Structures are given as C-alpha cells and as structure tokens.
Design a protein around this ligand. Structure first.
Ligand SMILES: Nc1ncnc2c1ncn2[C@@H]1O[C@H](COP(=O)(O)OP(=O)(O)NP(=O)(O)O)[C@@H](O)[C@H]1O
Ligand SMILES: Nc1ncnc2c1ncn2[C@@H]1O[C@H](COP(=O)(O)OP(=O)(O)NP(=O)(O)O)[C@@H](O)[C@H]1O
Ligand SMILES: [Mn+2]
Ligand SMILES: [Mn+2]
Ligand SMILES: [Mn+2]
Ligand SMILES: [Zn+2]
Lengths: 173, 1024, 173
C-alpha cells in the first residue's frame, strides 16, 4: 500500500527521467493546499552532484537538500543506484508541518557513489532565474500535481515559496 | 519617558560567548574591530544602541551565582582561570557534562544571516508597539537559535551550570529590579496561588467538567498575567518560565495577527511555534485554543517600582497597588467570561440547551457575581538600601533575592493554615430558607435539592429522572418542543441537578471556544470573540470515562472495519463521519477517518442495559473482546519542588533531610556537608575546581575567618599573575569573599537561590511538560491537566505501567525514542543539537486509581489526590545511601483498586542519580512487573502466582542469605508456571526492601516483592 | 592528502578485525594529549548497527555517531561493502579541536547495507559495562598508539573520556 519516493527540486534540469510512477496511491505526502508547499522533506548532510544530478552523501553538518515526496518507484529499473530504507515517519525531518503522518513508509532516494577521487569541496546554491522555477513547475509540478493550473489560482504562491525556501549546497565542479 | 531597555539585557552577552573566549581560529575577534561584547554590539542592529553601564556592573552580577562562585575579579577578567574544552553541566547534577562541539556562528557572514532571520520576523512591526517587538523577541530569540541548528553554550566554561539563555533571561528579570532602583525607589516580588484547586477540579460528573475546571484554573491566571506581560513585557514572570509556554505563544501570535500583519511573516514564526513550543501539531489552529491547560495555579513575578498612566513609567504611588490590581483583574476576568457566555447563549436561543443557558443565566446573575474560584496574593518589597551602597552593590547584596524569596513563600505557609472554600463567598440564607431559589425543573419536595456536580451548592436546573423525559421536559421550563430534548438531553444526563457554577461549567464545556475571552485578554472586545465563535460551528468532542474504557474496543473495530460493520450499518456505528468535529484527544484525531463513528456513546451501546445483548453477540462472533468498564486515572507530581526552588537538599535526599531537618540543620550536618561539597567541587571543570576544593578544605573543620585562607590565596595569587592586562590588584579580599560565600552555603545548608536558578528550573519544567504531553498521547491517554511537575490524565488500565515507567524515566531526562522534536538523552533534552538540562535529581510520585467508568469523579479525584498527598509522606522504604541502608519517603507509585493498594518504589538510591549508571535504575521495578505481566498473558505463568506468594514470604523475609532467596523465588515461580521453563529472575536488589507506614488506614505489605503481586492484582482487576 | 580510516567504538567486541595496519599515515588526527582523547570525529544522520558493527545511513538528524579518526586502509580488500570517500577537513564537526588539519582527507567509514524491510526504531545507547571499556582500551586503544601503556600509565584520562565522549545510536533491531 504505502511505498513512496523522495524527489528534490534543484535549479538545473534532469529530473523527470527518474520515475514513471507519478501517482502511486491516493495522495502524496507534500500537500499544496492553495497556501504553500508544506511537509517538504529536508535531508541533512547531503548534497547534489551537478552532472546528471543525484543526491550524494557527505559529512558537512550544513549541507542539505529540500525535496518533496511522492508515491512512486524510480523508473521501475532503478534500485541499483538508489537508497531504499524504512522509517517510522517520526524520524522524517519535514518543514512547515500541517498535520500528522502515516507512521509507516517505504522510501527510495537518489543514492550516489561518493567517489573519493574527487577532492570534495561544495558551494551553496539558490533557486532563482524564474525560468528555472517555471520549468520545474511545468516539468514535475504538473505531472505529480495535475491540480495546479486547473483550479489553482495561487500558483504564484507556489512560485514564491520555491523562490524563498528551497535551497541546497552543491559540489559545483 | 521611555525606559525598560531590557532588550539589551537579553543581548549584553551573546550566544556566541564561549567560543570567542578561548577561540580555536580567532576570526570574529579580528573581523569586527572590551573583547567579546563587541559581537553583541554588532548584533545590536534592530533596536536601540547598547547601554554598557547598566547591566554588567549590576543585574549581571546579581542574576546568576557565577559572580559569587568564581569571584567578581575572575568573573570579569575572564582569562585568569581558563580551560580549553567547553562543557555544560546539569544545574542539579554537576556530575554529567556535555560535548558541545562547534556548530555556531564562526564566520562574519553567518552571524549576519541570523541577524537577517531575526530581522525579517522583526522588520514587519512598527514602533507604536515598542513593547510588542520585545515581547515577540523574548520568545523567538531561542527558538530561532535552535531552529537553525546551534548548540547552546553555558554562561561560562569556568562554571558550566547555567545555559546561556537562562542567564540572559535572568539578567532581564533582575533588570526589573535594577531599573526600579536606579530610578527613585522600589523592588517587588509578587506571588499568587489559587486557593484549593484540588477541591475545584474534583467537581463534575463528566470528564468534560474536569477538563474545563482545570482549564479555568489556568485561564483565569492567564487573564490576570496578560496585564503584566503586556505592561512590563513577558519577562516579568519567574514562575512558570514562559520561554516554552503554549499559552504565551498562542496569545503572542494571536496579538500579532491582531492589528494587521502580513499573513506571510506570521507563518514564518507560526512554524517555529508549532514545531517547538508545541510538538509539531497545529491543532490549536484547528481548535483555535491551546489544547492543554498548562498554567500551575501558583505564579511569581518580579515587579518593578514603576507604573503607567503618566503615558510612561512613573514611581508607584503606594504599596498596595498590585494586590488590589490582580484581585480586580481576576474578578473582571470571571465576569467577562460569564458575560460572553450570556452573549453567545442569546446568539443561539434555539438548540434547546443554549436556550436553557439563557433562561438560567438571567435568573442567577446575582449568584454568578462571585467567581467559583478565588486566589491568595502575597507580596514582598525591597529598597535600594538593601542592594546598594550609594555607589555600587553591597557585599551580601547577593543574598537579598534569596532572603526576599525565602521571605515570600513563608507568608504563603502562614495563609495556608486556613482554607476557605469559594462557596462561602455566596449568600444563601434567604435563598435556601424563604424559597427564593430559582428552580428550572421540579421544585424539590425536600427543600432545595443539592447539586450533583459540586454536591455542595443548591441546584438551579433539575433535569427529571429518566422515566418519560420528553413529556416531562415540555410541561416544565426546560424545553419547548420535541426537538430541543435531543439537544438538551445531549449535555445534561436525565437526572442531573446543576448549580449555577456547575451549569456554567457545562455550558463552557458545550463549546470550549469562549475560553479565548480570557486567553487574549483586553485584546479583542468580548463581542468580537463571540462573533467569531458564532460564525464557525465546528464541534469539540471531549471523551468520557466510557470513551476511554472503550479504547481497545474501538481499536479492534478499526482493524475489522467492514467485517464488523457488515451486520451493522443500521446502528449508527459504521456510519460515515459526516461532520468536521475534532478533539484535543490526540488518539481521537488519529482515528475518526478510520471507519468507525467514534462519536458514539459506549454508555448507549454496550455499557447499556436495554442493549448489549446485540453487542455482546457481535463482539463474540467477530473475535472481539467485550470491553472492560474500568479506566485508570494517573496523577503525578514532583517531590519537594518547593524545597527545590528554595534551594534545599531535600529534593536530593528525600527521606533523610526531611522537612524539620531545616528547623535545625546541625543534626544533619554530615549529609548536607557531604552533598553540598560534592556538588560545589563538581560544578566547574576549568582550572578552579582545585582552588574551590582547597577553599572547602579551609571551610571544612571550621578553620577560622581567613585564619586559613593563606592556604588558598596562594592558589589564586600564583594564578592571577599569569595575565598582565589585569588592571588593578584586588586578590587580597576576593579570596576572602569566596570562602565567606562557601561557608554561607555550607552553614545555611542549601544552595542560595538566584533568578538564574529559577528560570533554569521552571524552563526545564515546561520542557518536561512538553515531553510528558507527547508521552501521554502515545499511550492513548487523555490529559486533563499536566503542568510541569504535576499531571492528571485518564489512561486505559493496560498502558499504565508502561506509561509510568516511560514518564518517570523521561522526567529524569532518559528515554529511548524521540517524542516529537524533543530528542531526550541521558539527563538532557536534545532539541536538534541544543542540550537543555532536566530534573534527574528530583523525585516524582504517581497515584493510579483503577476506577469503574461509572464511579463518581468527585470521589475518584479526591481519593487520587489524597492517596498521593498523604501516602507520599507517610511511607518509608529501605534505600541505600553511601552504601548504607536508610529510609526514604518519596518516589512511590501508589496503586489503588476498590480496596487493594500497593506501593512501588522508584529510587532505591536516595541521591537518585549521581552518575550515568543510575538512569536505568529508574523505575526498574515497573519493568519487572511488566515482564511478569507479559508472562501471564502468554499463559506461561498462572495467575495463581498472585495467590501463592504468601506461603513464600514468611520464609523469604526471615532470611539473610541472598543465594537462598533466589532459589526460593525461582521455586515460587517454578510451581506456578505453565510452559516448559519460564525465566523471570527478579533482580535480587529488591530482596529485603522494607516498606513501612506511620499507622494510617492505608494497608500495605511490608515488602516490595509482595507489592509487586498486589500491583498485578490491581492491574488485572482493571480488566474485569 | 594522507589517507586515514575512521573507526568507531560500539559496545560490541566487533572492532577487532577491521584495520590490519592500524597506521598508514605520518601522524594521527586523534591525540591523547595529557587531557584525554581529543579531535574526535562526529557524523550526523547515521547509526551503528552493532550486529556486524558498522554505520548505517538514515535521514534523521536525531541520529549521530562518534569515533576516533585514525590512519590506515580498509582491510586491503574492502570498498565492496565498506565506504570510500574524501573530505576537505574543513567542513568537519570535531570534538575538542586540538590536532592537525589535513585540508584534504580520504577516509573509510565502516558501512552496512540498508536491508529495507525492517523499520529502524533507533535508540540512543552510550557506553556502559565498564569491563567493555577496560578490554576496549586493551583491544583498540593499545594497537593504535604504542605511547599508550608505554610512556604513560595514567590511562584513567582516556577511561572516563570513553564513557563521556563516545555515544552512538543503537538500532537494536
Ligand atoms: N491548571 C491546573 N489544573 C488542575 N490542577 C491544577 C492546576 N494547577 C495546579 N493544580 C493542582 O492544584 C494543587 C495546587 O497545590 P496546592 O495549592 O497545595 O493545592 P490546592 O488544591 O491549590 N490547595 P491549596 O494548597 O490550599 O491552595 C496541586 O494538586 C496541583 O497539581
Ligand atoms: N515555590 C514554589 N513555586 C511554585 N510552585 C510551587 C512552589 N512550591 C510548590 N509549588 C507547586 O505547588 C503545588 C503544590 O506544591 P506541593 O506539592 O504542596 O509542594 P512540594 O514542595 O511539591 N512538596 P510535596 O508535597 O512533596 O510535593 C505543585 O504545583 C508544586 O509543584
Ligand atoms: Mn493552591
Ligand atoms: Mn509536589
Ligand atoms: Mn503537599
Ligand atoms: Zn453544583
């Protein structure tokens, strides 16, 4: 029944080629309620590798990534490069909480080879250049959320929230 | 003019304070260019510039004890007694430290970032409400510091007892006194304790009456202190510390929502509030009120000798201002509440019930003038003759705040000897004699028909008995049609007699939103609150005793939703939830949207008589265990909390230095002089611990005044000359004041209290509150009241041992799971890398009553309170103190079940914790009883085990051989086991534990191993 | 960029066959320098699964592990089920910063598999059972540094620091 996956929202491209399940069950954890994108996950100590963007494990206490969680399985061909793991959902570090949680979940995440060979230095990144937020809405936020642009008048609030909150650190090499 | 510049009193010393001293890389000290407050000055950007000559030469030396522990020369010079590391020691336990690490503002840039986060939340406020920005800052200054992950710092690595925040808030609290004495003259201490709250809570048929009784107890005091928190700012309350206060944060963001503030910055702090001040549920937005009454009916205040109405602060005119003010404000809160009740009632003259509320409020206004609950207010004052010498502080100016506080509480003791119930303020002679009593219902054939909730007042509304009510309510003043009966009988069980106060309770419990009338407080007009309340109609459903007795059945019916409601769907059980109701009962919200109509009344379905043949058969076929009629009423409280706040040692050794061992401390000289030195030496790792224990070696054995300090001044004068920038030489006297202070402590027999002590305590108290809140909800309980030390919750008899174990271990600050965002760890409370201390050295007692769901809540609550307050002070168990068996008093768990009692110790060591090895000894018997309960469920051991121990105790008590008693208990378990080979292995530290009593009607077996079986008999009677 | 190996200390007797040559660099990040152990490595978001005692990557920030950072190679056969990554030595979160700064560091984290079928109800467990301390100082705290028990007999200054500074998370599942 309950088997979802966490997707992040970076500034760059190469997102929507990761999942063919974009509905899963009956809902998704992250719930836009015409006032703001709430219940977004926040992985601490992890970051992205820019080339073919995937989430990498690091050890800086400050590195983090804020992505949303949908019911799916990556490409139905992954689980060779992704990190599946189970939590009681009280160990999930969300943001802007609106309610309780289902308390039992099955998650996948973009797992990445650390590749020691790279002298690991990072650089923070911010979402701007609204061509970026527009394309990330038009690429994932309609396929995961068909509701937006149908009856959603506060799409502009979605844009503002992705502008204001979503942030992360990147190796930038 | 404008004054009260305590915004810098909260910032004079930054939260970056301990790394800039003994820096590792030393960057911020060179990128900001009298050493470390440069950073705070840079942090001073949102408001007035820093005043440096008003809060370091006073109100910083007077706030905390460091000024007297280290010494006023090493305190400021901050370099002559150093250490590399950075630890943090629990205030009560100087034994356990912490590894602070380094996640703090290091770069000159991230500090700007934290300033920007403060700004964006504090830039949307104008200057007309000068006090409102300080108000919001007082709350969020730590919430932003810990929200962004930053571990908090002690006041100084030379004495890591107080967290950097408690010191700051303490300086701010003392600033109320210091401003009031740099001005003309005054300094005040105001204490308020509600008279007889236990009697008041024990007044109500339904649990929805206990809930609102406790909620009123909290809300009236909140209404009276609304005036102070708006007048002198929030940091005027010294108890309870409102740094983690749900009521305060609610009031705060509701006042911020008032007057108009963009609904985009309100969320940035509402998330902070919902995550930390609450635990992660915003149901107080869906209920519109804080769901738990958490204000202790006993508060304190540091009041300044100033007053408004000169449009600014002028000297107080008299010395009876605040007493009269709080009295009138309290009565005003009650009258405003009942006025709003009448308004909301008139707004709904339909619905039957509210029509009755109308037509009885108009009849009994002259009886509702008197509040159902009165208070008792004391005050103590001080003048600059006491804390000043016309140029600076005095020596002994530190022992002032103690002597005043110790003063104030004593006054309360005096007034306590006489108890005057609130019902005595009424005038009922002409009513109850000349038949002037208003009587909605049947005029009693016998005088005037006492109430059924309070049982003491004459009842106004007399609902008939259930013979034929519909034809009995219409021909009387209660009803008007056949429709109102279905809503009058909905909140007044047929037969209930109600007094004016009890009916006002029932009316407030009909919808718990009029309470906002008091929660906001002169903030909105009463009509404006009511017009919201009459706008939305969402139902707040409080459980009953039956709804909590039937928890496991509702559970079993949500795991068989369709199957168990196939044969149903004609009984309004599998009926689809059609409303937008919600409850402050977390377990209710967890379900309801799980397939079963949780609004049903088990008294109406299976706890009923005309029915329950049907329901028994149903539960039989679908493998459902027909419910039990018993719930469990759990009540808790800390022991010697007053003695704790007064700095005594009784909270440390509860059973030895009892209470009369402070009428003369010389008889307990050994224990106090061991424990106080053990603590003082152990607080402060640094380079001063050896210095301090040499000072004590001096004090030890009454080595005369400075006739010995020549042994110790060396240990300072050799060190004072490690630094050159030390301006003047002042080591000839500070070494004398140091041992004078240490002798003061060791000769008074108690740690001298300071405001830092009090805020550090009563903040950990609210943190433990937030912890036990999520603990109760884990065990499907229902929190009637839980404020800090106390607790009053209704749980099923099944998860009461588990709950007691978990809650006790958590009160000490030791657990296994995370409880929301309060991730507790071996004596501290880790909120996302922020270590706040807890109360491990404090003892907490419990009082479980396994009561039938139909027992009168009056007597249940009275017996629970009485068992706790009495048994906790009359029974003694064998405790080991310094490897020597003594007798102890507190930390017991007193179970009662209609005549069966049992006591379970929870300490077994009189200093309950002195290391980290102790945190598993906590309530280590309740898990023994749990292990034994999970053997009788599995059918491995027979219940005869509980009816067999006697013929083994007569031999197990006369024995002095351990390895013989072990065989004996194994044979007592062997003879009553049902499977191949059970393994229980009692921990053999419980043998010889001897419980006793000072000849009370409580009967108790004199050995813990028999109290275990009596506790099991009680628990299992709870499943009858 | 001298290669080091991160080793931790759970209650188990499991840290024995992990580093064959307990050295391999020209110094040691950690140091027992008259005050006890200093410069301990802390990593956030992990937990030691004591059965086959190795770290496990979760997403919860409540979870942390602490262990002594030492020099060496991962059994000369690992990086199949172990971990191999590099670090800039600056992003680190160190306890008692008293030792050197490498500015570029390749380390090896003893690592385990997710086995995403059991829900990881994790508990905090610091060191107890003083016997395990006293035979840990024998097993590891003597094979990493010969200065231990040769130059100084005052081993108490690491004894209490074992209980005070080494606290990890036990899954117990
Ligand atoms: N908000 C509250 N709701 C319910 N009970 C409370 C609340 N605050 C305090 N109490 C309880 O009320 C009592 C207060 O202590 P104490 O004052 O000794 O009792 P009292 O019933 O108020 N009688 P008295 O001592 O004369 O004032 C304790 O039993 C508290 O746990
Ligand atoms: N000085 C104090 N300041 C604030 N609350 C206090 C103070 N002393 C007691 N209380 C509280 O008042 C209520 C009743 O106190 P009470 O329990 O009678 O005192 P105690 O010192 O706790 N002794 P004990 O009977 O063993 O519990 C509880 O809420 C106590 O925690
Ligand atoms: Mn009282
Ligand atoms: Mn108490
Ligand atoms: Mn008492
Ligand atoms: Zn009554």
């Amino acid at each position: 029944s309950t088997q979802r996956e966490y997707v992040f929202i970076p500034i760059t491209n190469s997102i929507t080629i990761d999942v063919k399940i974009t509905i899963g069950g009956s809902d998704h954890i992250t719930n836009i309620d015409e006032r703001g994108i709430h219940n977004v996950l926040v992985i601490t100590g992890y970051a992205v590798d820019e080339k073919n963007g995937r989430l990498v494990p690091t050890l800086d206490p400050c590195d983090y990534v804020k992505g949303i969680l949908v019911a799916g399985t990556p490409q139905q061909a992954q689980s060779n490069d992704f990190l599946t793991l189970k939590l009681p959902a009280n160990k999930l570090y969300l943001i802007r909480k609106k309610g309780n949680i289902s308390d039992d979940l099955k998650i996948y995440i973009p797992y990445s080879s650390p590749d020691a060979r790279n002298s690991m230095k990072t650089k923070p990144v911010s979402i701007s250049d609204d061509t970026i937020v527009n394309n990330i809405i038009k690429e994932v936020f309609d396929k995961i959320y068909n509701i937006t642009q149908k009856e959603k008048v506060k799409i502009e609030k979605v844009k503002e929230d992705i502008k204001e909150l979503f942030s992360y650190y990147a190796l930038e090499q | 003019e404008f004054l009260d510049y305590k915004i810098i009193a909260l910032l004079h010393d930054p939260p970056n304070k301990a790394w800039v001293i003994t820096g590792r890389a030393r960057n911020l000290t060179q990128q900001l260019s009298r050493k470390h407050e440069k950073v705070a000055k840079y942090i001073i950007n949102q408001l007035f510039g820093k005043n440096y000559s008003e809060k370091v030469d006073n109100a910083d030396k007077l706030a905390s004890s460091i000024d007297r522990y280290l010494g006023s020369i090493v305190y400021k010079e901050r370099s002559l007694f150093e250490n590399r590391s950075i630890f943090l020691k629990n205030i009560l336990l100087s034994n356990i430290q912490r590894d602070i690490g380094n996640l703090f503002p290091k770069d000159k840039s991230k500090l700007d970032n934290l300033i920007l986060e403060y700004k964006k939340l504090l830039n949307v406020i104008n200057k007309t409400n000068l006090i409102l920005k300080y108000q919001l800052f007082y709350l969020i200054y730590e919430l932003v510091w810990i929200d962004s992950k930053y571990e908090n710092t002690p006041s100084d690595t030379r004495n890591p007892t107080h967290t950097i925040f408690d010191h700051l808030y303490a300086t701010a609290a003392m600033m109320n006194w210091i401003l009031s004495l740099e001005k003309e003259a005054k300094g005040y201490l105001l204490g308020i304790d509600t008279i007889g709250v236990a009697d008041f809570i024990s007044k109500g048929r339904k649990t929805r009456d206990l809930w609102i009784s406790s909620y009123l107890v909290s809300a009236l005091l909140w209404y009276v202190i609304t005036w102070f928190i708006e007048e002198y700012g929030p940091d005027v309350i010294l108890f309870p510390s409102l740094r983690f206060n749900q009521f305060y944060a609610f009031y705060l963001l509701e006042k911020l929502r008032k007057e108009g503030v963009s609904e985009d910055v309100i969320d940035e702090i509402k998330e902070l509030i919902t995550k930390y001040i609450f635990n992660g549920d915003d149901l107080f937005e869906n209920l519109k009120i804080p769901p738990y009454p958490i204000i202790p009916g006993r508060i304190t205040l540091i009041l300044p000798g100033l007053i408004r109405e000169g449009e600014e602060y002028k000297k107080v005119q008299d010395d009876n201002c605040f007493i009269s003010k709080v009295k009138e404000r309290y009565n005003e809160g009650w009258r405003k509440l009942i006025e709003g009740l009448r308004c909301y009632s008139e707004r709904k003259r339909e619905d039957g019930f509210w029509n009755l509320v109308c037509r009885v409020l108009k009849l009994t206004e002259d009886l509702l003038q008197t509040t159902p609950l009165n208070i008792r207010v004391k005050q103590v004052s001080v003048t600059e003759d006491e804390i000043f010498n016309n140029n600076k502080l005095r020596s002994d100016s530190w022992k002032i705040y103690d002597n005043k506080y110790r003063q104030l509480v004593s006054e309360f003791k005096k007034s306590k000897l006489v108890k005057v119930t609130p019902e005595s303020r009424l005038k009922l002679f002409e009513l109850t004699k000349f038949d002037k009593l208003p009587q909605i219902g049947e005029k009693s054939k016998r005088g005037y028909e006492f109430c059924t909730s309070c049982g003491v007042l004459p009842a106004v509304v007399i609902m008939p008995k259930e013979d034929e009510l519909e034809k009995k309510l219409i021909d009387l003043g209660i009803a008007r049609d056949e429709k109102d009966v279905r809503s009058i009988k909905n909140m007044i069980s047929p037969g209930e007699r109600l007094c004016p106060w009890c009916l006002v309770k029932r009316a407030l419990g009909a919808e718990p939103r009029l309470m906002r009338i008091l929660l906001l407080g002169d903030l909105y007009s009463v009509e404006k609150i009511v017009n919201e309340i009459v706008s939305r109609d969402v139902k707040i459903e409080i459980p009953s005793t039956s709804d909590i007795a039937s928890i496991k059945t509702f559970e079993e019916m949500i795991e068989k939703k369709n199957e168990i409601c196939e044969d149903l769907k004609e009984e309004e059980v599998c009926e689809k939830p059609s409303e937008s109701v919600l409850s402050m009962w977390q377990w209710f919200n967890k379900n309801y949207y799980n397939g079963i109509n949780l609004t049903i009344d088990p008294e109406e379905y299976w706890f009923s008589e005309k029915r329950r043949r049907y329901y028994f058969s149903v539960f039989r076929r679908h493998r459902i265990t027909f419910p039990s009629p018993y719930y469990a009423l759990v009540r808790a409280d800390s022991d010697y909390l007053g003695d704790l706040l007064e700095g005594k040692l009784t909270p440390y050794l509860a059973g030895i230095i009892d209470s009369g061992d402070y009428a003369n401390i010389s008889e307990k000289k050994e224990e106090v002089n061991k424990l106080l030195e053990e603590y003082l030496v152990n607080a402060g790792s640094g380079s001063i611990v050896d210095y301090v224990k040499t000072v004590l070696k001096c004090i030890r054995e009454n080595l005369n005044k400075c006739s010995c300090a020549e042994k110790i001044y060396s240990n300072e004068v050799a060190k004072v000359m490690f630094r050159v920038n030390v301006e003047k030489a002042n080591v000839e006297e500070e070494v004398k004041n140091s041992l004078e202070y240490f002798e003061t402590i060791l000769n008074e027999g108690r740690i001298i209290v300071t405001p830092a002590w009090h805020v550090s305590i009563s903040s950990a108290l609210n943190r433990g509150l937030l912890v036990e809140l999520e603990l109760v909800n884990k065990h499907k309980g229902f929190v009637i009241y839980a404020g800090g030390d106390d607790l009053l919750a209704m749980l099923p008899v099944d998860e009461v041992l588990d709950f007691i174990k978990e809650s006790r271990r958590a009160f000490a600050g030791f657990g296994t799971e995370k409880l929301g965002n309060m991730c507790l760890e071996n004596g501290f409370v880790r909120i996302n890398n922020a270590y706040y201390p807890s109360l491990p050295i404090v003892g907490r007692s419990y009082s479980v009553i396994i009561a039938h769901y139909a027992d009168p809540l009056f007597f249940v609550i009275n017996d629970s309170y009485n068992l706790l307050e009495e048994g906790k002070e009359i029974i003694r168990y064998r405790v080991m103190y310094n490897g020597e068996y003594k007798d102890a008093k507190k930390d017991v768990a007193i179970f009662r079940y209609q005549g069966l009692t049992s006591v379970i110790p929870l300490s077994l060591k009189r200093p309950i914790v002195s290391s980290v090895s102790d945190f598993n000894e906590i309530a280590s018997i309740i898990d023994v009883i749990l292990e034994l309960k999970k053997r009788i469920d599995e059918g491995r051991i027979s219940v005869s085990l509980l009816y067999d121990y006697e013929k083994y105790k007569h031999l197990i008590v006369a024995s002095d051989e351990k390895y013989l008693t072990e065989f004996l208990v194994k044979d007592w378990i062997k003879r009553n086991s049902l499977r191949k080979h059970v393994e229980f292995t009692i921990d053999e530290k419980l043998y010889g534990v001897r419980l006793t009593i000072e000849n009370y009607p409580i009967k108790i077996p004199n050995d813990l191993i028999s109290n275990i079986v009596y506790t099991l008999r009680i628990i299992y009677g709870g499943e009858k």
